[PDB]
Amino acid sequence: MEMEKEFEQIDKSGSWAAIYQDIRHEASDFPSRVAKLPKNKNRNRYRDVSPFDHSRIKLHQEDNDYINASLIKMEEAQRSYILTQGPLPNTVGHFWEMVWEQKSRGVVMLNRVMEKGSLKCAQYWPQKEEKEMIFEDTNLKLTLISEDIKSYYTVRQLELENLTTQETREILHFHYTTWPDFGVPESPASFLNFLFKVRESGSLSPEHGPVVVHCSAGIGRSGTFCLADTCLLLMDKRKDPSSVDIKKVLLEMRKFRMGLIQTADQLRFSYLAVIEGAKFIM
Numbered sequence: 001m002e003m004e005k006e007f008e009q010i011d012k013s014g015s016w017a018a019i020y021q022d023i024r025h026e027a028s029d030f031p032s033r034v035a036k037l038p039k040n041k042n043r044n045r046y047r048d049v050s051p052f053d054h055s056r057i058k059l060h061q062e063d064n065d066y067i068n069a070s071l072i073k074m075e076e077a078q079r080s081y082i083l084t085q086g087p088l089p090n091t092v093g094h095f096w097e098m099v100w101e102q103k104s105r106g107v108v109m110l111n112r113v114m115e116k117g118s119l120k121c122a123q124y125w126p127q128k129e130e131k132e133m134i135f136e137d138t139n140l141k142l143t144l145i146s147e148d149i150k151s152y153y154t155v156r157q158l159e160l161e162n163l164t165t166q167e168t169r170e171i172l173h174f175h176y177t178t179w180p181d182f183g184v185p186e187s188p189a190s191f192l193n194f195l196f197k198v199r200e201s202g203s204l205s206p207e208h209g210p211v212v213v214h215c216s217a218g219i220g221r222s223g224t225f226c227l228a229d230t231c232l233l234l235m236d237k238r239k240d241p242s243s244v245d246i247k248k249v250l251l252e253m254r255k256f257r258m259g260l261i262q263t264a265d266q267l268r269f270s271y272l273a274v275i276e277g278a279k280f281i282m
């Protein structure tokens with residue numbers, strides 16, 4: 001079926017939970033043996049969210065190459081994304097090592113450091129220009145260059161220096177600051193505006209490594225971001241845009257990382273974002 005009328009048909013019939021459970025039943029199951037090794041217990045934020053072995057990002061290190069991060073490679077759309085958990089106190093150095101080694105230009109952050117009164121990720125970037133951060137375990141230095149605070153999101157320019165080679169690179173930090181503590185946004189308008197700002201920066205484009213996107217577990221809000229981006233790109237590429245099937249795209253992405261889209265409300269919000277976004281494109 002088309003998307004906008006399949007949407008109203010699920011709303012009128014109140015069957016979002018049944019649709020979402022079908023997706024969960026059909027989703028791929030691949031091994032995640034490296035994630036579960038005992039030496040990696042303090043590299044995982046949640047015991048039930050792990051990268052598959054076949055698509056995990058490897059750190060360029062011979063001691064321990066593990067980070068909870070996955071490469072989502074969308075062949076028809078010609079887009080790639082790295083989805084990862086919010087960094088932990090003992091993985092902030094690994095996180096920036098990955099950004100460096102994978103040649104990423106942008107980092108997309110969809111959570112606040114504290115939500116619901118608990119810590120959802122480490123304060124992994126500097127808050128003041130004159131107070132830089134050094135990661136001694138991976139030999140990187142990180143400096144805040146500038147910060148632009150807007151009503152729904154903040155954009156930061158950061159400098160990452162490999163202290164071994166003295167090479168430097170500019171990284172863009174796109175921080176969506178207004179996702180509610182509970183539920184999903186009422187309107188997708190600010191989320192789409194944010195997506196378009198990331199696109200306009202070059203961070204999603206083939207001349208760079210894959211964008212790094214995270215929330216707390218790296219599957220819920222993070223899944224919504226890449227699902228909406230990929231669906232809209234396919235609608236531009238194809239002769240028949242109504243042939244884009246959001247459930248099939250989500251199942252394709254779940255071949256690369258488990259659990260993408262965590263609730264039926266997030267599924268409905270993804271439909272809404274793609275629907276409204278397709279009107280603005282034209």
Ligand SMILES: Cc1cc(C)nc(Nc2ccc(N)cc2)n1
Binds near residue numbers: 123132134
């Ligand atoms: C010398 C010194 C002393 C202190 C207290 N912080 C830093 N740098 C730093 C900046 C930002 C974060 N998040 C962490 C550390 N550096």
Ligand SMILES: Cc1cc(C)nc(Nc2ccc(N)cc2)n1
Binds near residue numbers: 089093122132133134
């Ligand atoms: C200069 C400086 C000063 C301080 C206090 N920390 C850092 N780096 C850092 C590394 C890992 C975590 N978690 C936090 C900070 N760097």
